[PDB]
Amino acid sequence: LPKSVDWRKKGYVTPVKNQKQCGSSWAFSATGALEGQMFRKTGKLVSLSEQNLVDCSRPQGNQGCNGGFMARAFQYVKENGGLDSEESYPYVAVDEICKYRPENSVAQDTGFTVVAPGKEKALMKAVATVGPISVAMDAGHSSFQFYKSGIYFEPDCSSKNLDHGVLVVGYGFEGANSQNSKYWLVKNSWGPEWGSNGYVKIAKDKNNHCGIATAASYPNV
């Protein structure tokens, strides 16, 4: 595998978005993974509709602004036959009536692939070979809310109890040694202003920190 990967540098990632006051990180993580897969498939980067997911995926088990899961979102895209673009179905950060329009669909999936659980090595292979990957993590600490730069490492982080969906867009290391000070490049949905231009470097190969490899997946396009 490569020593480092950064899908942002290859055009697979949209600019950072902001979920605002709605517990929709699961939707942002899902559209991020679909955006990278549609880009790999067609060469066109199109921002997808998290609102489409928020308003319409209740049957698949999601709860809009009250929470959900990326796998349920990919299930909805598969069952629904499509997903609208953000331009056509804008994000408003509140639960609204489902307004899916098939004529406006710009993405599709036949289901999804799950990365072997808890395996950071399996996650690194998926990131290097597929593109950005949806992952769940434990973001429930003040150190994460206030993160600004460097490799994030929180001793109280759990690898089992997860509460926020994010997107792994790559991995790398600090310094000249490729085997130390390793990190996962993660795109968050708290706006460009949070963290490092909206991203966070999470410690890699340090016992699956914050559970990044615990429940990872990607849509099959």
Numbering used by the authors: 1 to 221
According to the publication:
Hence, we set out to determine the crystal structures of cathepsin complexes with representative peptides of cleaved substrates. As a working model, cathepsin V was chosen because of the resolution of diffracting crystals (up to 1.3 Å) and crystal packing with accessible active site cleft.
The MPD molecules were bound to the primed site region. Of these, 26 bound to the active site in a substrate-like manner and several of them with a different binding geometry in each molecule in the asymmetric unit.
